[PDB]
Amino acid sequence: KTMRVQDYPLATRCPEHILTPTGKPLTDITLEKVLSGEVGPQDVRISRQTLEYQAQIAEQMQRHAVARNFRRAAELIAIPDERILAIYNALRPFRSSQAELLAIADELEHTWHATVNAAFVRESAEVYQQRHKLRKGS
Amino acid sequence: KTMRVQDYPLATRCPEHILTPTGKPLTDITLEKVLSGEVGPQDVRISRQTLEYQAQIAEQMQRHAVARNFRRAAELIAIPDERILAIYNALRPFRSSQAELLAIADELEHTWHATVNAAFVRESAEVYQQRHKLRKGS
Amino acid sequence: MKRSKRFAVLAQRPVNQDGLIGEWPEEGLIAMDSPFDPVSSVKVDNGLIVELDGKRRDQFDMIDRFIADYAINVERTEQAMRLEAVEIARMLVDIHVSREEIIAITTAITPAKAVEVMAQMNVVEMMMALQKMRARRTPSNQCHVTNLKDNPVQIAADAAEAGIRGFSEQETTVGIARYAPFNALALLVGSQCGRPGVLTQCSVEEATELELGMRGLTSYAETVSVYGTEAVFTDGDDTPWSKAFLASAYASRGLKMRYTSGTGSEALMGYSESKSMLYLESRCIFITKGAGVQGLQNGAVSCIGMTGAVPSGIRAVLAENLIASMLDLEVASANDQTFSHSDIRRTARTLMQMLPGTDFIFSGYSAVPNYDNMFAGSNFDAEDFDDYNILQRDLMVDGGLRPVTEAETIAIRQKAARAIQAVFRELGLPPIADEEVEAATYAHGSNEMPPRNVVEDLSAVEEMMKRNITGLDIVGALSRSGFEDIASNILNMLRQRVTGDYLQTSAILDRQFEVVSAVNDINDYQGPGTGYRISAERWAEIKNIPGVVQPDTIE
Amino acid sequence: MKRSKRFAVLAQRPVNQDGLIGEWPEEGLIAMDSPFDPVSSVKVDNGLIVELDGKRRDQFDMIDRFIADYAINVERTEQAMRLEAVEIARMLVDIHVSREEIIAITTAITPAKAVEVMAQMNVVEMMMALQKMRARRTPSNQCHVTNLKDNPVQIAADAAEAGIRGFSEQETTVGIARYAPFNALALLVGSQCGRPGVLTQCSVEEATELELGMRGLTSYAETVSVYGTEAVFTDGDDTPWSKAFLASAYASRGLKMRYTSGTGSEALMGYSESKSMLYLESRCIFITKGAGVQGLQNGAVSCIGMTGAVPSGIRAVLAENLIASMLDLEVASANDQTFSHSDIRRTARTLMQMLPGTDFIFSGYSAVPNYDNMFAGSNFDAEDFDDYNILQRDLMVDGGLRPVTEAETIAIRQKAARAIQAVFRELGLPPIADEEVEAATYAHGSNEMPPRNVVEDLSAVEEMMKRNITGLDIVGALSRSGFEDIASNILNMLRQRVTGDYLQTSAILDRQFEVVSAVNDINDYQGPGTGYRISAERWAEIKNIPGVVQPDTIE
Amino acid sequence: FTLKTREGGVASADERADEVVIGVGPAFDKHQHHTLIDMPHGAILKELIAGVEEEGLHARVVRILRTSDVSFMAWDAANLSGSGIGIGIQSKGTTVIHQRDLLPLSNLELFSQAPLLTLETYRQIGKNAARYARKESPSPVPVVNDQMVRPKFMAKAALFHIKETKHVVQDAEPVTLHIDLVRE
Amino acid sequence: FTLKTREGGVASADERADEVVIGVGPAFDKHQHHTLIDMPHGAILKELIAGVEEEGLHARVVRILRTSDVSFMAWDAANLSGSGIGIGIQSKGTTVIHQRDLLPLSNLELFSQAPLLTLETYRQIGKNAARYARKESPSPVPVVNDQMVRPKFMAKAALFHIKETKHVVQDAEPVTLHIDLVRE
Numbered sequence A, B: 001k002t003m004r005v006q007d008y009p010l011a012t013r014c015p016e017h018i019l020t021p022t023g024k025p026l027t028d029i030t031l032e033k034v035l036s037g038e039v040g041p042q043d044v045r046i047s048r049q050t051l052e053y054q055a056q057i058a059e060q061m062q063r064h065a066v067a068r069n070f071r072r073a074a075e076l077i078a079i080p081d082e083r084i085l086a087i088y089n090a091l092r093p094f095r096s097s098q099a100e101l102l103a104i105a106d107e108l109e110h111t112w113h114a115t116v117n118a119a120f121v122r123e124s125a126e127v128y129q130q131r132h133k134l135r136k137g138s
Numbered sequence C, D: 001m002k003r004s005k006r007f008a009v010l011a012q013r014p015v016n017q018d019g020l021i022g023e024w025p026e027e028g029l030i031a032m033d034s035p036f037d038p039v040s041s042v043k044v045d046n047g048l049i050v051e052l053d054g055k056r057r058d059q060f061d062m063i064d065r066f067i068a069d070y071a072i073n074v075e076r077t078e079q080a081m082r083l084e085a086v087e088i089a090r091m092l093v094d095i096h097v098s099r100e101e102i103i104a105i106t107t108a109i110t111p112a113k114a115v116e117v118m119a120q121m122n123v124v125e126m127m128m129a130l131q132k133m134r135a136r137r138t139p140s141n142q143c144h145v146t147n148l149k150d151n152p153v154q155i156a157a158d159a160a161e162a163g164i165r166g167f168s169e170q171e172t173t174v175g176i177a178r179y180a181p182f183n184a185l186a187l188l189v190g191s192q193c194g195r196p197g198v199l200t201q202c203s204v205e206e207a208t209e210l211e212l213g214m215r216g217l218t219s220y221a222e223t224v225s226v227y228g229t230e231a232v233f234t235d236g237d238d239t240p241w242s243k244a245f246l247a248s249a250y251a252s253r254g255l256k257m258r259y260t261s262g263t264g265s266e267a268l269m270g271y272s273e274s275k276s277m278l279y280l281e282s283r284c285i286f287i288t289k290g291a292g293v294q295g296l297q298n299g300a301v302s303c304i305g306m307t308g309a310v311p312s313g314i315r316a317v318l319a320e321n322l323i324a325s326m327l328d329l330e331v332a333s334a335n336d337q338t339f340s341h342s343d344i345r346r347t348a349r350t351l352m353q354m355l356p357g358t359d360f361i362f363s364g365y366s367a368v369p370n371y372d373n374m375f376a377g378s379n380f381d382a383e384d385f386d387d388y389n390i391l392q393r394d395l396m397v398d399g400g401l402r403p404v405t406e407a408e409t410i411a412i413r414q415k416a417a418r419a420i421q422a423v424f425r426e427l428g429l430p431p432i433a434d435e436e437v438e439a440a441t442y443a444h445g446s447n448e449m450p451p452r453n454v455v456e457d458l459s460a461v462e463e464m465m466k467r468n469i470t471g472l473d474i475v476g477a478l479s480r481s482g483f484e485d486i487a488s489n490i491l492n493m494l495r496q497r498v499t500g501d502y503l504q505t506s507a508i509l510d511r512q513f514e515v516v517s518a519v520n521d522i523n524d525y526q527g528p529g530t531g532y533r534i535s536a537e538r539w540a541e542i543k544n545i546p547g548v549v550q551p552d553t554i555e
Numbered sequence E, F: 001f002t003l004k005t006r007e008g009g010v011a012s013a014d015e016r017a018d019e020v021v022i023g024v025g026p027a028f029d030k031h032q033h034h035t036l037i038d039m040p041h042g043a044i045l046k047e048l049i050a051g052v053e054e055e056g057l058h059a060r061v062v063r064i065l066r067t068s069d070v071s072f073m074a075w076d077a078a079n080l081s082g083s084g085i086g087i088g089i090q091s092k093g094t095t096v097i098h099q100r101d102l103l104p105l106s107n108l109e110l111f112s113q114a115p116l117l118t119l120e121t122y123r124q125i126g127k128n129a130a131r132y133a134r135k136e137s138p139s140p141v142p143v144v145n146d147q148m149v150r151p152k153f154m155a156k157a158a159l160f161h162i163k164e165t166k167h168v169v170q171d172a173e174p175v176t177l178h179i180d181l182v183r184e
């Protein structure tokens, strides 16, 4: 449930608790399962739980900003790589209109359940509007 | 009579208290007088009082070792330069016999009243004797 | 002629070829303490920073806002900010104050407060402080692995060599953007051939790099830039939010990453807002802190040409490293870019970090001769390797690099060259001929490498990316060609994404792919008798340089 | 020939020409902490040290005895020696522990104890400590002024230039002994042309030097050597007693002086007694302290080739400088001798003292190209001048030197040339044609200097010394040739003997011949916010380098 | 003859498909006239145009005012070009061959060390660009690198960019540059 | 032929007013055989003499055993020469032209950088000496200096000096050494 500094590194101290987002245990990512095709690129990813533990380790190190980063990133795991890239790019200067950024926030919150990232993007919309980084022409 | 750290530098704080060992005030050592010839090499030297003053300032800075060196040096002021060089050399390894060092100590103590230097040389005689630094076969 | 030969000789001195300029504060051409820089200050109102360095919240630019809302401990900033800058400066060198107590304070101060603290310190003080603030106990090193021709065969070989030399991280980039996937790929294979666990990155356009990482072609990202002014951030094609999301994207894939900033970028890019380089860099450091990014590559970095140009520039560079470190961020402390034609001068610039030690003394030591360095040259390169090893022995300073023999280098380079060769053959990529494998084996740089069919490689990379090749495809290709070990090594580099251990501050991997970070390898310096001290084994390795003759055998 | 070109290039790097050796403790070929070195200890029996670092008084050699009875505060040693070496080491970097507090302890410990303290410190800690232990608040610099030909004209010229560049002390020596008097004479004239107050010495055989001093041809002596073993001391032609007497002889004439020692002399001279270079040096430092000599020139000095040859040698050099400083001695910290073919290596060796600052960062920076350096070359020379000013500007470190324009240098060099010409004319010495004056005016080294009838010079000197020429005779000559200002300067250098002010620790003179020593310019470092900080005017001077372009004018 | 730029009206976003748009910096051949190594802007433009025309395509030169950043300048040039291929160059010499669809900071070819660029290299930049415009895959112009360029020129580059940037007009539309052939 | 030294018997002070005593180190041409630059002791000990005779004096060779210091070597040599002049030389090569009456650490001429001494030097060190031994003031052998000698040789010079110093015999008197020209 909860990790502690002495549980780190998690890969050595608490391997069992480490699962791929796909449900596979760390012990499943081997040359064998890779060559056979049992383990594919989508398996060699981090899961929400893991990031949560790493976050716990971080904050207990007084690295709260890092912990918050990890927790926020945890919400992005299930989102497709292409969508992650598109959202990032939509966040770059003058790419999006305020409405587009809000629409993205809606998707993040209700489709991906990435509540923190939705708030994050909602925040970016306001910031971009006040600092003029939204696509030129409302 | 006694100097204080606040009296240093002497040349600037207490010029009047600085005399050449020849009995000339610091203000006498000028280009004018050197040209005229009334000020010569034997005048551009330090007096016992000055070294004593520097010894005081040094020990008040907790540099007792230096103060001790200055006070011992004070005793050497009146000894002719050639004799100073001679004594120095006599102290170099293997130059002197125990007796010759002791005779030098006698000269220092009774002819120059350089009692500390006399004790210093008497000390070298013994050390040299014990550490075999006296003239071989003396 | 009536001219001094003394000055004639001096005029021909390499150092006089260095671009030095007088300060010009209006254009941000000043290392630190700009008369236009703000006076530190902060005000918390109802749990929200509404005042930052003489700026009200309604005056905040994107950076002020991000910093105010994410980079500062609001509940402690007002108190911490009550400390004098010089007092914090004293704490930094005070052996009775732990890095933890300092961190509790710095993570609660402002960008201006941090630079004012630096203003109170001379370089000896900063080094004294840096050795205590460094997050990881054992300093490490990062190198560049590149070449003029973006040659994959040479890249793999140099990576293998750089690996046995001790570098824990390796970074490549490209002359031709389209070559990136091959550089990344070759770097990954070569890196795992020299020393298993070596982290690799491919520095290119942001989205491009994230993609390389998502496809498992790299094991981390570093040049994820942030800037000190909105205008430069804009030309950097990001905002604190797009970059924060980016950092988040990296973490969401279990990919280690840090940001890159560095004094001088805003000036070189034309929008310094009349602020000193260090103040703007301080903002970058706080943006890094606020984004929740564990580390930062700073110390002028690529813009060392800017900072080094002005007075106290090299001191300002050490200062920015210290600020990053005292804020409890992992620091890859530059020394990775050329700025002087003088050995004397470049050496002084690097000793600032090398003597006290940082998470990565060099965030890009050139593992290849500088003519092949695609970052336009590193402060130190492959030809300084012997000098660097002698320095460590001279000063009993762990520089993060060890000596290697020609035999084990030729062997490791040959293996890497064959490995990448086999990976190309297997993936049906343009052929890597034995002539190339052999040339990469004994080469110094690309001058010994036969020319490749560039158009053919570029078309192949496009086809490769289209084929969605990932790190697992490399693993399989290695596995089927008799490089089970390198396949496993790469697989273990990818497995880091699943555990998330190497996401923690200063994290690097030992030869068994075990994580070594500030968390399990904490720097706990409290003066003589504490902190990192070279091991007997490591010290022996440092002094046992090949060639050193046993004196009693000389005649 | 399948060799690695990488290694072929490395094998060719200049640094590989340096003489490095494995340790050989038996012969003292080990920088520090030799297994044969004694364990620190002391025992006071009735106000007399009867035990010193594992040796009973009945076992004391001349050095042990001298140190025991003169160099250690007997009343506090037993107690001070109960402190752990690591504890004293912490105190050295502890900003809450004053320089004076440390001195009350160090002046009460033993030679073995001091090196044991050093053993607990890395170079950063040592520099941190060195900036606090330095006696004089403002670090200074000493240079060498020599030339392969012992040419009076060149010396005078070089001394003048060295003077405006900023050196507070200048040292000369001869390739041909007999030339000594002219060298001292020339150096004396040239120094006062460049900067009124510059101190000058002529390093030759002891008795010979003292005589030069007694005759007022120098303003101080430095190479008054002491050694770590009786046998080496003997080959040095002295004992602790003759040297202590010699020190007093200088003081008795109001002549400033310091001893010179340095790691490696004993091992190079064949009698290390199987002890480490540093331990032996520690004995030398204590001998210096006990003699009551105010300063010491150490840090390997001439035997840098010995110390730099072994592991941690360069760290040991810093350590020996620190031991002398913590022992409250003025420290002319070497950096005056060549040991490496590498610019990277020699730079690291010098930054050790330059960064923190010592009374004299260089106890012999060569103010002439190294081919003219008669001390077999200095670690830095005339050709490094520009780099050095740039280093100061880079690190905001006061290196004790400033930039000079070619115009003012040519002017100063000609005047000095004319002066040394007017002097030789007034003293009826071998003529100095305008072909020499003009040559020395625009010269770099003795290569631009017309040869001189040597024999005719060695005869004028032998006869000049018979005529009992003294500093005053020089004063007169300069006075009768219109060089009143310079005649006066030399007289004011000689007048220093009467006041005795420049006999105090770390004493040098400002342009008004007023003493600036550790007594009236006390270093008072207590961490940031204290101690020496470059003044706004000095800082501006450091930044103001000729050739630094004003940014707003670049087209 | 000397190549001389003459500002016309707003630069169009698609004059012919068989073209390559050359976007020059805000001060190119106007407020600044030479590169870091004193190479006249006219002769460089002459080489670029020639390189392109040499390949059968039309070289249309425009001035980018909304930015001084070479990536965006070339990107703008690419989006203005009917061939999708563009060339961007700052007054200091820095040059990039861009292509619409590519991310702003990405590119087809980059020349990040201006001081090393020769008039010949510029000729090849125009050729390759045209080759890209013809949707071909020309061998990239061999990248050049000198470890001492930054030490020697970075500060000067910044000063040059500072000046050029002084003429950036927020949101200003590109400006057509008529290519006048003037007597040397 | 090769110059070889032969251990004679205890030497004695003064033996003709026209003799320039040569004092070789305790290991010269005996336990050691070459200088730092591997120059054979015989060839050296051969030039020092030719220089002597070319001026018209008799060179006498002895082996200093009481010390390994070169200044003290040339001094003991100077105090064994009826001319007062004497030459001292260590196995590593360091040489000094001394003269009795002079302090031990002083000298007439010094050659403090062995590795830079050629045969023409170990020759002129004969001529000048003889010039001295005959009360002349010859122009001293132009001193030579190389800033990298210490970096290259100092460590080695210490090693050679350690070897030489191993054969120092406390108080032992000089031992005349006869000259044998061994057939090539």
Ligand code: B12
Residues within 6 Å of the ligand: C173, C174, C175, C176, C177, C178, C203, C204, C205, C206, C223, C224, C225, C235, C236, C237, C265, C268, C269, C302, C303, C373, C374, C375, C376, E036, E069, E070, E071, E092, E093, E094, E095, E096, E105, E106, E107, E110, E111, E112, E113, E114, E115, E145, E149, E150, E153, E154, E157, E158, E161
């Ligand atoms: C200094 C430098 C920087 C600095 C200064 C940027 C600036 N715009 O002023 C900083 C760190 C801020 C920077 C950032 C970037 N850089 Co950069 N940069 C360099 C470096 C090390 C040296 C160039 C130099 O000093 N030349 C000497 C002077 C006198 O010549 P100059 O022509 O006047 O130089 C200018 C150009 O090089 C220009 N520039 C710098 N980077 C880039 C990137 C692109 C895509 C373009 C078009 C231009 C450009 O900036 C210099 C100053 O004006 C080169 C290495 C190399 N091989 O050249 C990498 C290099 C050019 N950069 C590169 C990259 C990818 C970038 C980024 C896109 C990275 C990112 N994470 O976003 C950003 C983009 C920012 C921007 N708008 O340019 C790549 C280009 C790869 C490619 N296209 O093939 C290189 C080769 C390698 C690297 N990873 O650092 N960079």
Ligand code: B12
Residues within 6 Å of the ligand: D173, D174, D175, D176, D177, D203, D204, D205, D206, D223, D224, D225, D235, D236, D237, D265, D268, D269, D302, D303, D373, D374, D375, D376, F036, F069, F070, F071, F092, F093, F094, F095, F096, F105, F106, F107, F109, F110, F111, F112, F113, F114, F115, F145, F149, F150, F153, F154, F157, F158, F161
């Ligand atoms: C290293 C050095 C030292 C070292 C090492 C001595 C040793 N015996 O090992 C130390 C600091 C201890 C030393 C001391 C002295 N030195 Co010294 N030394 C040098 C220096 C800087 C470099 C020589 C070198 O490393 N050559 C390279 C190696 C590979 O060659 P080497 O032949 O094997 O070199 C040896 C000789 O030079 C010898 N040597 C060193 N000093 C002296 C002095 C005299 C008079 C003699 C005969 C030999 C000698 O020691 C070297 C190592 O074995 C020279 C500068 C120069 N111009 O050469 C000054 C120099 C030779 N020294 C000099 C002097 C005066 C002395 C002292 C007499 C000073 C004093 N205050 O007493 C003492 C005497 C000690 C002794 N018994 O030799 C003068 C000679 C002037 C002259 N005669 O014309 C020089 C030119 C300049 C100087 N002031 O330092 N020295």
Ligand SMILES: [K+]
Residues within 6 Å of the ligand: C142, C171, C222, C297, C336, C363, C364
């Ligand atoms: K890097």
Ligand SMILES: [K+]
Residues within 6 Å of the ligand: D142, D171, D222, D297, D336, D363, D364
């Ligand atoms: K000196």
